[PDB]
Structures are given as structure tokens and as C-alpha cells.
């Protein structure tokens, strides 16, 4: 009778962007389409509402850039690109 599943419905974790497919071309439109198809709506019934919409995607950075890996790794990548040797061997060292 008093089914909790019908009373305690709340958005799941990572809800706003979970369905976003991994792509770089048009992530927001692609994510929007994925949400629409995931929700069970078919394009033939949504009509004109499906053409211009866009939704948040994981491929888009908070700054508004196309990202292909977690931002920490991007930070790690640039950091690792610059690591001069701590101790070097040269004849004139005192």
C-alpha cells in the first residue's frame, strides 16, 4: 500500500549530466537528445521541441571548454611537462 518507492522520489546523484554521451562535436545538443530518448519520449511525438534544446554534459568544462579527461589530470599533465632535474652533474661545482 504505502510504497516508499512512490513517496521518497528524489533526483539521483549526478542527475544533471548522467546521460551525456562521450563526444566532442556538440556535447550539449547530444546530451539533450540522450535525455529526451532516455525519458522514453520519441522525436515523432515531441515535434518541434526537439530541435534547439541543449543540456549540460560532462565533456564541457565549468569554464566552458571541451574536455576529454578529468580536469585534475589536465592540471597534472601541464605540471609534469615542467620538472627540471633537482641534482645535475657538471664538472665545475665546488
Amino acid at each position: 500500500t504505502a510504497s516508499p518507492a512512490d513517496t521518497n522520489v528524489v533526483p539521483a546523484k549526478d542527475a544533471p549530466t548522467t546521460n551525456s554521451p562521450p563526444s566532442t562535436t556538440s556535447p550539449n545538443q547530444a546530451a539533450a537528445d540522450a535525455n529526451q530518448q532516455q525519458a522514453g519520449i520519441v522525436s515523432s511525438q515531441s515535434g518541434p521541441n526537439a530541435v534547439g534544446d541543449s543540456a549540460p554534459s560532462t565533456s564541457v568544462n565549468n569554464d566552458g571548454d571541451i574536455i576529454t579527461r578529468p580536469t585534475s589530470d589536465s592540471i597534472a599533465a601541464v605540471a609534469n611537462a615542467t620538472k627540471p632535474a633537482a641534482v645535475v652533474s657538471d664538472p665545475q661545482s665546488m
Partner: peptide, 11 residues
């Protein structure tokens, strides 16, 4: 400088 229009959207 960056032209940023929509949150969660490409600049």
C-alpha cells in the same frame, strides 16, 4: 578574455 554566454556551455 573569454566570451562566456551560458553556464555549463562552451564559450
Amino acid at each position: 578574455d573569454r566570451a562566456n554566454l551560458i553556464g555549463g556551455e562552451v564559450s
